[PDB]
Design a protein around this nucleic acid. Sequence first.
DNA 1: CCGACAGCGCATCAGC
DNA 2: GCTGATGCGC
DNA 3: GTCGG
Length: 318
Amino acid sequence: ETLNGGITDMLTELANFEKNVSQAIHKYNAYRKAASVIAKYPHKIKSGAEAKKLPGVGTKIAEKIDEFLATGKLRKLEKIRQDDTSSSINFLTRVSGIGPSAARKFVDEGIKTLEDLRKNEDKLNHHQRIGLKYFGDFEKRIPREEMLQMQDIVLNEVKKVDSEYIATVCGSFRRGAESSGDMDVLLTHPSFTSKLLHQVVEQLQKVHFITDTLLKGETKFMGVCQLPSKKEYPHRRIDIRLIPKDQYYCGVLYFTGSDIFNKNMRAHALEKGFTINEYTIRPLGVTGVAGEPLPVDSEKDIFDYIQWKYREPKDRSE
DNA sequence: CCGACAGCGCATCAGC
DNA sequence: GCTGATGCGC
DNA sequence: GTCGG
Ligand code: NA
Ligand code: NA
């Protein structure tokens, strides 16, 4: 963190500007990817040319690094920070439900601060009101100890609805992370293959675990939950996905991550003669044509098809 | 030089 | 009202 | 913004 922290903070701040103000999502992911590869770089960068050797860092970023290492700042960023419009737009996107488009809309109307939002809740949809209500709590990290407690509640209540259910808490948590930003739960049932989600949500609301709802459909749920007290715990964001039984363990593998791990596994699968997405793993023909989905009854089955040794979730960082 | 870069599920918006 | 586009989260 | 056809 003390190695190239100044560079990674710069690229991250540049990433947010492109996403929120410029609305250039591909430039946003470009800076983050660069900020990521520099973070894992075990040396203190001395020049843009050194970082240029890394994948994801091109000419423009190398040029920016050179300026930062010589001046301690970036003229582009300093002018962006002092810009009233850009800073206000970039900040409002921190509210869940407010993206680049809505933030641009609000700032143009004069709505630039968190207080201005509260004075204009008639201009906000349901999601934005909830995001505003739990603004502070949503930016808080969820310690693993609390994630375990949340997991106990979810697994207990899901089983009380129907013992035939299968629930898996994925994300960085399943990889053994010390903290999380949210809770992603994958759900399935033998009767559902390629009104089960409602019953689970209702039960979690019955024990007052789920407090609010952002979106709710037949296969996907996003809302707000909170751990019971005896100091009251912060409200956390929870997502619950209903996945078909024949596509469940492919989904588990997908949402467990990491993003880099999935990229490598998809690459290794292609060399073995298989293709893997979020839903299914299919064999490839001699002309590149994919066949019918392969039977998956376990996460270890997918590793067996591609002749790969089973990777523990804790060892899926890359 | 120039397109890819993940894209799906849900809520809301724009047009008919 | 329906249908498709847009916006947003992940 | 970077990478690769
Ligand atoms: Na490079
Ligand atoms: Na937001």
